[PDB]
A paper describes a structure:
Epstein-Bar virus (EBV), a member of the subfamily gammaherpesviruses that also includes the Kaposi Sarcoma-associated herpesvirus (KSHV),2,3 is the first identified oncovirus. Similar to other members of the family herpesviridae, EBV has a characteristic three-layer configuration: the outer lipid bilayer envelope containing viral glycoproteins responsible for host recognizing and membrane fusion, the inner pseudo-icosahedral nucleocapsid enclosing a 172-kb double-strand DNA (dsDNA) genome and the middle pleomorphic tegument compartment fulfilled with 20–40 different viral proteins. All herpesvirus capsid shell consists of 4 abundant proteins: the major capsid proteins (MCP) constituting the basic capsid skeleton through forming 150 hexons and 11 pentons, the small capsid proteins (SCP) binding to the tops of hexon MCPs or both hexon and penton MCPs, and the Tri1 and Tri2 forming the heterotrimeric triplexes to plug the large holes on the capsid floor. Once the viral dsDNA genome enters the procapsid shell through the portal that is located at a unique 5-fold vertex of the icosahedral capsid, the viral nucleocapsid is joined by the capsid-associated tegument complexes (CATCs).
By symmetry relaxation and localized classification, we sequentially resolved the structures of the C5 portal vertex, the C12 portal, the C1 portal vertex and the asymmetric capsid at resolutions of 4.2 Å, 4.8 Å, 5.5 Å and 7.5 Å, respectively, which enable us to build atomic models for the portal protein BBRF1 and the CATC proteins of BVRF1, BPLF1 and BGLF. Similar to that in KSHV,22 we also observed a turret-like density located between the C12 clip domain and the portal cap. Based on the agreement between the turret structure that is rich in helix-like densities and the secondary structure prediction of BBRF1, we tentatively assigned the turret to the unmodeled region of BBRF1’s clip domain. By docking the atomic models of the periportal capsid proteins and dodecameric portal into the C1 reconstruction of the portal vertex, we identified two portal regions involved in interactions with capsid proteins. The first one is the clip turret, which interacts with the trunk domains of five sets of Ta tri1 molecules. The second region is the portal wing, which interacts with capsid floor elements, including five sets of the spine helix in the P6 Johnson-fold, the β-barrel in the P1 Johnson-fold and the N-anchor of the periportal Ta. The C1 reconstruction of our portal vertex revealed CATC densities are as strong as those of the surrounding capsid proteins, indicating full occupancy of the five CATC registers surrounding the portal. The helix domains of the BVRF1 molecules and the two BPLF1 C-terminal regions form a helix bundle lying on the BGLF1 molecule. Each CATC binds both triplexes Ta and Tc.
Numbering used by the authors:
A (entry chain x): 199 to 395
B (entry chain W): 5 to 104, 113 to 337, 345 to 395
C (entry chain S): 5 to 50
D (entry chain f): 1 to 160, 172 to 301
E (entry chain g): 1 to 9, 13 to 50, 54 to 125, 131 to 301
F (entry chain e): 9 to 71, 82 to 139, 150 to 238, 256 to 364
G (entry chain W): 1087 to 1149, 1179 to 1332
H (entry chain T): 1087 to 1135
Write the structure that this text describes.
Amino acid sequence: DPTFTERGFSKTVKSDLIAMFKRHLLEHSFFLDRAENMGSGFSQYVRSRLSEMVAAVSGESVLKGVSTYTTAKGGEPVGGVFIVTDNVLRQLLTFLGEEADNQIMGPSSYASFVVRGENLVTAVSYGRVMRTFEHFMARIVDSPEKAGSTKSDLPAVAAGVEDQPRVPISAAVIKLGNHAVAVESLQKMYNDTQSPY
Amino acid sequence: EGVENRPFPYLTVDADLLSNLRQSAAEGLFHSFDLLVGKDAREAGIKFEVLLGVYTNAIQYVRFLETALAVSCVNTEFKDLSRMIDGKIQFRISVPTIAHQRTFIVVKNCHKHHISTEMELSMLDLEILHSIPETPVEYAEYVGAVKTVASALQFGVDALERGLINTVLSVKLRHAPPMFILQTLADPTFTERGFSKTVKSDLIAMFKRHLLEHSFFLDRAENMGSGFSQYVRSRLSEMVAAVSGESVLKGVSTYTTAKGGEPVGGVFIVTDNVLRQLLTFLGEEADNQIMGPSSYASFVVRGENLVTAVSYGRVMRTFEHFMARAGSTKSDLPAVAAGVEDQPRVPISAAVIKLGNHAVAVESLQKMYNDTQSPY
Amino acid sequence: EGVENRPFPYLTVDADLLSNLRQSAAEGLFHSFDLLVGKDAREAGI
Amino acid sequence: MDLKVVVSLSSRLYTDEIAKMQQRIGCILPLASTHGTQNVQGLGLGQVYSLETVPDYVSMYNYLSDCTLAVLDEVSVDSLILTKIVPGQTYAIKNKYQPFFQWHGTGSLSVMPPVFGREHATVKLESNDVDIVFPMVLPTPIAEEVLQKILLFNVYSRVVVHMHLGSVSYLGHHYELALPEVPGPLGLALLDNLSLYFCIMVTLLPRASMRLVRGLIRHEHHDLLNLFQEMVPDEIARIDLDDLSVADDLSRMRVMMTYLQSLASLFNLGPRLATAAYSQETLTATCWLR
Amino acid sequence: MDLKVVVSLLYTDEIAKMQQRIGCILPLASTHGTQNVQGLGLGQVYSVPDYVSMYNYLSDCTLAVLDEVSVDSLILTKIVPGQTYAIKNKYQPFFQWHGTGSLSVMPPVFGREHATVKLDIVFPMVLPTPIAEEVLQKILLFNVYSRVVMQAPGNADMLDVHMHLGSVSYLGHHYELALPEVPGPLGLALLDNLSLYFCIMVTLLPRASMRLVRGLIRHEHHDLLNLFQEMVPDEIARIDLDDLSVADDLSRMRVMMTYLQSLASLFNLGPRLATAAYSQETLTATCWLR
Amino acid sequence: RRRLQRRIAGLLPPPARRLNISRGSEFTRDVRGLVEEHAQASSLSAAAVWRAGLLAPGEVAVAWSGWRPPVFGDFLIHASSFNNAEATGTPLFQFKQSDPFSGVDAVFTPLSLFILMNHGRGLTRMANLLYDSPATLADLVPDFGRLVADRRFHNFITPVGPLVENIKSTYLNKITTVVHGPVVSKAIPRSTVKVTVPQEAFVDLDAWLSQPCPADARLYVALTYEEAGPRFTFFQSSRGHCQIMNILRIYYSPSIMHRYAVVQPLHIEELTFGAVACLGTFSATDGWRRSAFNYRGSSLPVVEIDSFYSNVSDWEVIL
Amino acid sequence: EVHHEMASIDTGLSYSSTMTPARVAAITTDMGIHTQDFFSVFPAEAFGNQQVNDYIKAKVGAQQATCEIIVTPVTADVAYFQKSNSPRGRAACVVSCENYNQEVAEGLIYDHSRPDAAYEYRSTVNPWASQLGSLGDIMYNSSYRQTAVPGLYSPCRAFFNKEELLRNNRGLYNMVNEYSQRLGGHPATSNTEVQFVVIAGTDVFLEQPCSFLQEAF
Amino acid sequence: EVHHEMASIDTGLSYSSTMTPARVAAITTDMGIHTQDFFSVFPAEAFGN
């Protein structure tokens, strides 16, 4: 929330943020149990707090231009993913009414970023390899004056992740306003292995 | 001791340089050398540091008409504001009489605003900018220097544009009385006497009444159960009716709702979290596009004006309409819109809500202000 | 620090990275960073 | 180079202040910053010389020397254009100072805190509810005369003659100047440094010259001597008993001439202006910052 | 900008005499294009000799190196504080210059006939600053010591003030001087008034210092130093009068402050010219105005 | 008389003060002609020299601008009296030798000038690391102790400002220093130069006091006489010289009575408590960024006054 | 430097813009009790003796929300403190006296021959903060606050000063838009350790209905 | 002021360059007798009287 972190972190705002930390610990933590004694308005409370957890994440990935992992039925990008224990997952699915989807598209195999040949030369000689060497050549010794912008270089930030086959992936999807987060509980993975989730 | 061993492609030159070496390298004939015997006599393993790409933010220009704040302010590109010391507007308002005449000639004055930041440039990237390269390392230096200077110039005009939005927000906040005064003063049941003493005392009582009952409505929007949506609509609608729309530029078509011929008639400026809350209490919005002007209007000084401007000032807005001078509303209407008409009507992405017959647009500026590390 | 200041073809993405930035760097969220004000904001020489 | 600073007024301006300020065009004004646009606060000496009854002239000198200098030429409503003064540039400075000081040919100007009353060089800007005072500019000999008259009033406060000290005299006109009673610890600090210099002078003052001046007043009489009223001072009697020796006289002068440069440079407070080619028909001069 | 000044007027020996000094400087009258003979250096002031008026005249007008001498003109460039120049040590009192030494211009105390050209043109002396202040002291003490032995023969001796005054010393350079051994009393000599100022200020320094300490010590403590340095003077200058007519005391104080400031501005040598890299093989030096 | 029109055409145009730009990404030729300041160093071709325009009178123009050309004083010093690992941006001090015909001067950087003070009685660790023997510096001044003893050391040393280029010769080192002007290097990549002064020798005078901010805050040097050996401190301030003498007297107020208590002033020349000199001005906003200075072993803290404008003055005595 | 000028001009006759407070993000003042010392307000003033003066000055501890003290008798009923009123024991209303004059405004705000504006039956509640020479003006009015440090934010100064009492009694539209467009009611600071008062305009952003209404909660 | 840079680097590991003295031309100091004096080398030291 930028409205407290706007001033510049003097003494008299951190001594306020510590009291705000304590007030959010005393009241708003452990929010699944405040919904069971809520009575009737539990779905609104849980759907508020999940969206509040989402929007308070500065999710500015530099790879946010990569159109990976969209939802299957609609076509919206899946921005963000939840991880829960399996005991709370059914209560989350019943409290949030029903899923809007049962599968999401995504990359089928890992993108291959390999050492190319000019990369191999600078690998042997100095030992320092960049990501996209031919792209650096195109931006330096071919057209350096070309002012590259967001529509111009969006293939270069997506190292092959964008053209690879999109298979479905079975995962529960919920909808929080315009953002569509997909929930998953991998507790089945651990309980057959006797390690603590 | 000052020498690596990576498996270089070693050129196999056939000099007799092998001879008389170890007695020489025992004395340190060379200044930097590292003897490798045994298991160190190997082309070493390839080790490298991976540079996973460089990244930056393309600073987008936030054009002054690309934000919906310019529905609050129509504008005319005036190419010579340096030579305008003063601008006034005369209002002749005629008050009719009612059986059981008056004229309000009010004067309004303009006030100028100066804004200025300071970009900065080193003397290196001007002298290497004027000079010409011939080797491609100098060409690579030159394109970097012209990128820096172009970045500084585009930064300068972009900072000036953000300053224009800042000045607009400041001048709108300066002519902004609070809610708890214009909630009552707009209600004409208390200007009906004529502002004598005791009705003024009841007005300052009603200020205190509205302060502890109607201020901070959005905090009372959480404890009212499921009665929050109608409460928010009922507060913002009477805020809409609390402001005088009696303006002489209301006759022209500045901004439309981009889906009908509905005028938008207002703008809400909120923060980020207030916007994220309001678009959830007011449900689905109406639209996500607003038709508005693509460019500023233009008002130059032609020669029939320019003769007065060089003689003794007093340059009129519309000398042609003055030199043609009955009058009606629709005859005087195009002289009011002095260039705001026939703009090619480029849409503007901004959220619009609906309060009865007004389709008010509501937008947040934090995406602009909090990229400058300045408090909203 | 470990920051290299050599010029680069800085790829431009559209994500607004700078949400509460200068307060973060004056608090030192980043491991290692360089504040360049004014004259040093150019591409350094090769 | 472009040196234009426009100062934005936070409110409007009434017509009487417009008429008053357009008379005050070409005078030297101080500024808070050196940036592009500034507001009405920080302009003028009125922030440190407030609407009060006890002045402080040396802190005004400090505020003048610390900040930059400018000249006001174009003034209108809501806005008035200033032109900065930076070392390396030349300017034209007009003579619009109402105590009408006739300027010498090619002398040197000096800025000055307003000694001729607060109300003399002041525009009341009640529209922005603040006050702008105009710092006086007058030539360097009159500057040193005013300054030493100020310090002599500050040191003869504790003794008593008043009209013969707190009123300057010029070829053009004699003037009166406003006198406080205490300049605070900064004026006392100026007197501190002055007495420091002075007591080390009278430690290291040469004794050949006293032996000259005793026989010189008893032999000759001049305008440079008639202030003694043909009477030898008592320390001339109790000092010239000693013999006259060359070596310690040279060793005294070799430090005396070092100290007097510092004693001159301590009176360099306030920015100085070495101008050139003043004309008595245009009332302006080609000036630059020294 | 444009820097040349063409002045209008010679014959072959005049051509050779002016050609001898084509690297020296002299002041002008104005910064215009064409001028006359009378507007050239030190002509209208030095022909009774008096030092303080000539130093005031040298700080008054600007300065100029000369470049070429024709039959009827002298091509010369005035110096501006912007850019740098190249001048020469072509003066008959030869003071050897050094690297990064500040050069001064004093009016000629070394006699008319050395630094002149008989047509008139009088060139000022150029010489470095420690030599300048030391020759100032060693001409001033020579003046007062000559006046004393003209008054009283038993106070000093003539050879007593030539073992220590006829020679200046700077980095091993042990030069001599042309001291005027017959000044003549009642003024009428060069530097006759500067000694007459120095004696009056050294006479009024006790009346100043004691009055200042007694007036500053009542303001109890801004600083301890005004009473801390009460022990370093002798007690003879301490107990002098503590009582006089404050009209007379104030007049004496005002005259001593004015003469002190004028003398301290004169002991600062005037237009200080700064060198960068002197070359004795070429007798030239990079120089610019400061 | 029509040729005078062409002459006034060749003489008229000033540097561009205003420019009504429209957009930033266009990069018009007119705004380039505003921002293009001519260079000083170019490759050696007559067309390349003509585009660089170095043959123009006084200031550079392709066939005035508020900018000053710098001067470059040259010095010669013995190779042991200087360390070639000195920084580029460091101020220097000339000591005038006593021979009448000299040729070879004697320059002291403050690191070297420190060991003229310490020997005879961190920072001193580095000053003994670089200049290892004081005996190689104790002789460039012939009579140091007598000259301190009569307190005429300050009028023998004139500051020459910062260093630029050190051609590392074998025996007689030739250095170039800027006595006056914009301090900028003579290199083929013309890199910026920042004047450095060691941190322990340099106390701020602004934050020592702990609204009027000008642009040019000056840098002052100060030699002071202590009975524990004289010291060279440096001072940053945004005040006038009238203010600098008073606030320096108040700053040195303990040391004056320290010297008064330990050594009584028996003669008349000990009373001079050192002097000051303006070394010049710089930018008051971006001033005095800290940095580090490595020799092969150690690291002293050091300030970096960046983009300095050198201007020496004489000595004004502190008292 | 990039310069830009623009000249706006108001077109609607009445008010064309409203500011409404909506939410309370953080009560930043750390609202407790910490009264400031008068000995930093008046460091010069002292009693006759020195040692008893230093004894008291050491006993109270005279060396982040600032309270002040108005002295009142014990006979004030709690009903005056129950309703939100003016803290000086007198209903300091701004409009039941006439506008653009000084006689009847000073009569309603300081004279006690007319009763209180709120209650029908009493002149005041306390006579130590409502008289023309009370304790409240001798603490906080600017006419007797000379040789006091500016830059302290004594909060009770806004409930007493005469300049605000004349500034509010202009025309009501003039009062409200000069309240909005100029934020100078000599207010507090924003984020400092102790509350200073602000000097430079359009830098920090604060308004107060306290100087608009002269009441308190 | 012109400038020119050259960058040498030795591409032979051993000595690649030698220098003899070939012939004498003149012995420009005479192998004579003029001894130095310590009164100029050490002028500071002196005797009792």
